[PDB]
């Protein structure tokens, strides 16, 4: 799921 | 159930938060265990016009605390707990582990060059850098000499912590930047 | 530079 994947990448990188 | 409780104790998340993340995790990876390949695919979605292989793997290795070639949910949630809600010290220690590839307590110039190269490979295509910093080598020469106060070619945790507070751009690829800026 | 920072913020927007 792109919104799940986006959410955790944001925690790491955004 | 009983395990939610333990992971709630071990992280900065509430039970409902642990479970919400678990739902997402397991829906995204039904086997409950994601490997370096799956992880690279995840970055590839968001960085399709670059080569994210290297950086994804370096990040994967920090997640895989037990070094068994997989990220189990406990490792996944702990990584997120630290990087989103840890103390500034904890977040800096996490980023240090990312750079400290051989895990010997030091970041060498070579180790940092690898990390910075991986970032350029993943995202370099999309940014326009000032000419003096348009290669990994140029960038690293400056920031590594800046940080290496013992002039010994190896950065301690303290040197990396003090270096990043002074110049937050050193970790510009990480959310940690916003805690330092 | 903070060009990678700016990139991540756009690339991982949500
Ligand atoms: Ca593991
Ligand atoms: Ca090392
Ligand atoms: Ca040193
Ligand atoms: K960088």
CSV table of C-alpha atoms in Angstrom, one decimal, chain B residues 64-180:
chain,number,residue,atom,x,y,z
B,64,UNK,CA,17.6,-5.7,10.8
B,65,UNK,CA,18.8,-5.5,14.4
B,66,UNK,CA,19.4,-9.3,14.7
B,67,UNK,CA,21.1,-9.5,11.3
B,68,UNK,CA,19.0,-12.5,10.1
B,69,UNK,CA,18.2,-11.0,6.6
B,70,UNK,CA,14.6,-10.0,7.5
B,71,UNK,CA,12.7,-7.2,9.1
B,72,UNK,CA,10.2,-8.7,11.6
B,73,UNK,CA,7.5,-6.4,13.0
B,74,UNK,CA,9.3,-5.9,16.3
B,75,UNK,CA,12.3,-4.5,14.4
B,76,UNK,CA,10.1,-2.4,12.2
B,77,UNK,CA,8.2,-0.7,15.0
B,78,UNK,CA,11.3,-0.1,17.1
B,79,UNK,CA,13.0,1.6,14.2
B,80,UNK,CA,10.0,3.9,13.7
B,81,UNK,CA,9.7,4.5,17.5
B,82,UNK,CA,13.3,5.7,17.7
B,83,UNK,CA,13.3,7.8,14.5
B,84,UNK,CA,10.0,9.5,15.1
B,85,UNK,CA,9.9,9.9,18.9
B,86,UNK,CA,13.3,9.2,20.3
B,87,UNK,CA,15.4,11.8,22.2
B,88,UNK,CA,17.7,13.8,20.0
B,89,UNK,CA,20.5,11.6,21.3
B,90,UNK,CA,18.7,8.4,20.3
B,91,UNK,CA,18.0,9.7,16.8
B,92,UNK,CA,21.6,10.6,16.3
B,93,UNK,CA,22.7,7.2,17.5
B,94,UNK,CA,20.3,5.6,15.0
B,95,UNK,CA,21.7,7.7,12.1
B,96,UNK,CA,25.2,6.8,13.4
B,97,UNK,CA,24.5,3.1,13.0
B,98,UNK,CA,23.3,3.8,9.5
B,99,UNK,CA,26.7,5.3,8.5
B,100,UNK,CA,28.8,2.9,10.6
B,101,UNK,CA,28.6,0.2,8.0
B,102,UNK,CA,31.0,-2.4,9.6
B,103,UNK,CA,29.5,-1.5,13.1
B,104,UNK,CA,32.9,-1.1,14.8
B,105,UNK,CA,32.0,2.2,16.6
B,106,UNK,CA,33.6,4.5,14.0
B,107,UNK,CA,32.6,6.1,10.7
B,108,UNK,CA,35.5,6.1,8.2
B,109,UNK,CA,35.8,8.4,5.3
B,110,UNK,CA,35.2,5.3,3.1
B,111,UNK,CA,32.0,4.4,5.0
B,112,UNK,CA,30.6,8.0,4.7
B,113,UNK,CA,31.6,8.1,1.0
B,114,UNK,CA,29.5,4.9,0.5
B,115,UNK,CA,26.5,6.4,2.2
B,116,UNK,CA,26.7,9.7,0.4
B,117,UNK,CA,27.3,7.9,-2.9
B,118,UNK,CA,24.1,5.7,-2.2
B,119,UNK,CA,22.1,8.8,-1.6
B,120,UNK,CA,23.4,10.5,-4.8
B,121,UNK,CA,22.6,7.3,-6.7
B,122,UNK,CA,19.0,7.2,-5.4
B,123,UNK,CA,18.1,10.9,-5.6
B,124,UNK,CA,21.0,12.8,-7.4
B,125,UNK,CA,19.1,12.7,-10.7
B,126,UNK,CA,16.4,15.1,-9.2
B,127,UNK,CA,18.4,17.8,-7.5
B,128,UNK,CA,20.7,20.5,-8.7
B,129,UNK,CA,23.8,20.8,-6.5
B,130,UNK,CA,26.3,23.7,-6.2
B,131,UNK,CA,29.3,22.7,-8.3
B,132,UNK,CA,31.6,22.5,-5.3
B,133,UNK,CA,29.5,19.7,-3.9
B,134,UNK,CA,28.2,17.9,-7.0
B,135,UNK,CA,30.0,14.6,-6.3
B,136,UNK,CA,30.1,12.4,-3.2
B,137,UNK,CA,33.8,12.9,-3.0
B,138,UNK,CA,33.5,16.7,-3.0
B,139,UNK,CA,30.8,16.6,-0.3
B,140,UNK,CA,32.5,14.2,1.9
B,141,UNK,CA,35.9,15.9,1.7
B,142,UNK,CA,34.4,18.9,3.4
B,143,UNK,CA,32.0,17.4,5.9
B,144,UNK,CA,34.4,14.6,7.0
B,145,UNK,CA,37.3,16.9,7.6
B,146,UNK,CA,34.9,19.3,9.4
B,147,UNK,CA,33.8,16.5,11.7
B,148,UNK,CA,37.1,14.6,12.3
B,149,UNK,CA,38.4,16.6,15.1
B,150,UNK,CA,41.0,14.0,16.1
B,151,UNK,CA,42.4,14.1,12.6
B,152,UNK,CA,42.5,10.3,12.8
B,153,UNK,CA,40.3,9.4,9.8
B,154,UNK,CA,37.5,7.9,12.0
B,155,UNK,CA,34.5,9.6,13.4
B,156,UNK,CA,33.3,8.7,16.9
B,157,UNK,CA,29.7,8.9,17.9
B,158,UNK,CA,30.5,12.2,19.7
B,159,UNK,CA,32.2,13.7,16.7
B,160,UNK,CA,29.2,12.7,14.5
B,161,UNK,CA,26.8,14.1,17.1
B,162,UNK,CA,28.6,17.4,17.5
B,163,UNK,CA,29.3,17.6,13.7
B,164,UNK,CA,25.6,17.2,12.8
B,165,UNK,CA,24.3,19.7,15.4
B,166,UNK,CA,26.8,22.3,14.0
B,167,UNK,CA,25.9,21.5,10.4
B,168,UNK,CA,22.5,19.9,10.1
B,169,UNK,CA,22.9,19.5,6.3
B,170,UNK,CA,25.2,16.5,7.0
B,171,UNK,CA,22.1,14.4,7.7
B,172,UNK,CA,19.9,16.3,5.1
B,173,UNK,CA,18.6,12.9,3.9
B,174,UNK,CA,17.1,12.0,7.3
B,175,UNK,CA,14.1,13.4,9.2
B,176,UNK,CA,16.6,14.0,11.9
B,177,UNK,CA,17.5,17.2,9.9
B,178,UNK,CA,14.3,18.9,11.2
B,179,UNK,CA,15.3,18.1,14.8
B,180,UNK,CA,18.6,19.8,14.3
